[PDB]
Amino acid sequence: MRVVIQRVKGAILSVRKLEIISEIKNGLICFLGIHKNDTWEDALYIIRKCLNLRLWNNDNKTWDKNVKDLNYELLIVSQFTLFGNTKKGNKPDFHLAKEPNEALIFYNKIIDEFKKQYNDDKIKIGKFGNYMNIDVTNDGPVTIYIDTHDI
Amino acid sequence: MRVVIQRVKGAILSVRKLEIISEIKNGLICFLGIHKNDTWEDALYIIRKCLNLRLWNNDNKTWDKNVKDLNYELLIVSQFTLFGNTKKGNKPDFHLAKEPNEALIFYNKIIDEFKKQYNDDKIKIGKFGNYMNIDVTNDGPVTIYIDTHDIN
Ligand SMILES: NCC(=O)N[C@H]1[C@@H](O)[C@H](n2cnc3c(N)ncnc32)O[C@@H]1CO
Ligand SMILES: NCC(=O)N[C@H]1[C@@H](O)[C@H](n2cnc3c(N)ncnc32)O[C@@H]1CO
């Protein structure tokens, strides 16, 4: 499983009816990619990293507060393009991405778990399998990458 | 070298005078991280992929046009946080980043090479070593990740 985590001041997510369906204020936007062989343990790792990663400062020191400490939000967005393999040519190859129908069911379980480990109000999502327009205010910017297959 | 590429309809980047210092319309925002071990060839790989990756559709086929074909822009944003190591705990560790002063010089060369391979009016940047506020309209979204240390 792969994620790209960006720290934001706000993010506005729109799709065709454009029409807003999701917004957060301060927090994290997480672009989430599900590998065909991802397991539930891969998901858990991403969930707790997303929720406990210390991407904000204290007055005292840097990198010392996470999203929960600040009561901030998370906008989780499905991104199959993280498995866009560009090693062979300039046409990205998406072979490694779990196929959409299963990846949907897996995605919804992950969202369910994000909520259980934090709060229903705090987890926003996109619209899986649709075109999305996302207005983000990148705060830094801060951008973090995790691939669970590295452990 | 590490890069996160995102396809955008627009991006306004501002810093403390916060005033606007860079703006693009349709194109790519590239979050660019320099490893302490990167050589000029790491850079060349990244530049090539950024400029040539086919992240837009043609009328009759997907993943078939690059930023150049469409005459679109790129906003290049320096990002040491891409080496945020989180294997050990929940405090990210950034030791793999190239040291800032040398990194700026490297970064500046990369930007110039970007200007070379495309058009200096279509290449735009942020403010290395400074807090930046970037208003991005993500178009898709479409996010690509490349670590040169996985390749060659
Ligand atoms: N361009 C925006 C977009 O990525 N759209 C993707 C995802 O929202 C979703 N999707 C399908 N498979 C996956 C997967 N393995 N992981 C994450 N999302 C998936 O289905 C869309 C087209 O495949
Ligand atoms: N928060 C946004 C940010 O990351 N700002 C970084 C980069 O703009 C730049 N910088 C320093 N070292 C590097 C490096 N090794 N690679 C890329 N950029 C660097 O210096 C800022 C603080 O170190």
Numbering used by the authors:
A (entry chain A): 1 to 17, 27 to 160
B (entry chain B): 1 to 17, 27 to 161
What does the study report here?
One key molecule in this process is an enzyme named D-aminoacyl-tRNA deacylase (DTD), which hydrolyses D-amino acids attached to tRNA molecules (a D-aminoacyl-tRNA). Here, we show that besides acting on D-aminoacyl-tRNA, DTD also efficiently hydrolyses the achiral glycine attached to tRNA—glycyl-tRNA(Gly)—as DTD’s active site pocket cannot discriminate between D-amino acids and glycine. Thus, DTD is designed to reject substrates with L-chirality, rather than target substrates with D-chirality. An invariant, cross-subunit Gly-cisPro motif in DTD, inserted into the active site of the dimeric counterpart, is responsible for selectively capturing the chiral centre of D-aminoacyl-tRNA.
We solved the co-crystal structure of PfDTD with Gly3AA at 2.1 Å resolution in P21 space group. The crystal form had eight monomers in the asymmetric unit and, therefore, allowed us to compare eight independent observations of glycine captured by DTD’s proofreading site. It was intriguing to find that the electron density for the glycyl moiety was weaker when compared to that for adenine and ribose, indicating an inherent flexibility of glycine when it sits in the active site pocket. However, it is important to note that the carbonyl oxygen of glycine is rigidly fixed by a DTD fold-specific interaction with main chain N of Phe89 and by its interaction with Nε of Gln88. Thus, the flexibility in glycine was observed only for its α-NH2 group. Analysis of the electron density maps revealed that the α-NH2 group has a preference for the flipped orientation (i.e., the position in which Cβ was seen in D-Tyr3AA complexes), despite its inherent flexibility. On the other hand, if there were any selection of the amino group of D-amino acids, as observed in the case of D-Tyr3AA complexes, the amino group of glycine moiety in Gly3AA complex would be expected to occupy the same position. In contrast, it prefers majorly the position occupied by the Cβ in D-Tyr3AA complexes, clearly showing a lack of strong selection of the amino group in the opposite orientation. Both phenylalanine-to-alanine and alanine-to-phenylalanine mutants of EcDTD as well as PfDTD were found to be biochemically inactive on Gly-tRNAGly, thereby validating that the mode of ligand binding as observed in the crystal structure represents the true binding of the actual, full-size substrate (i.e., Gly-tRNAGly).
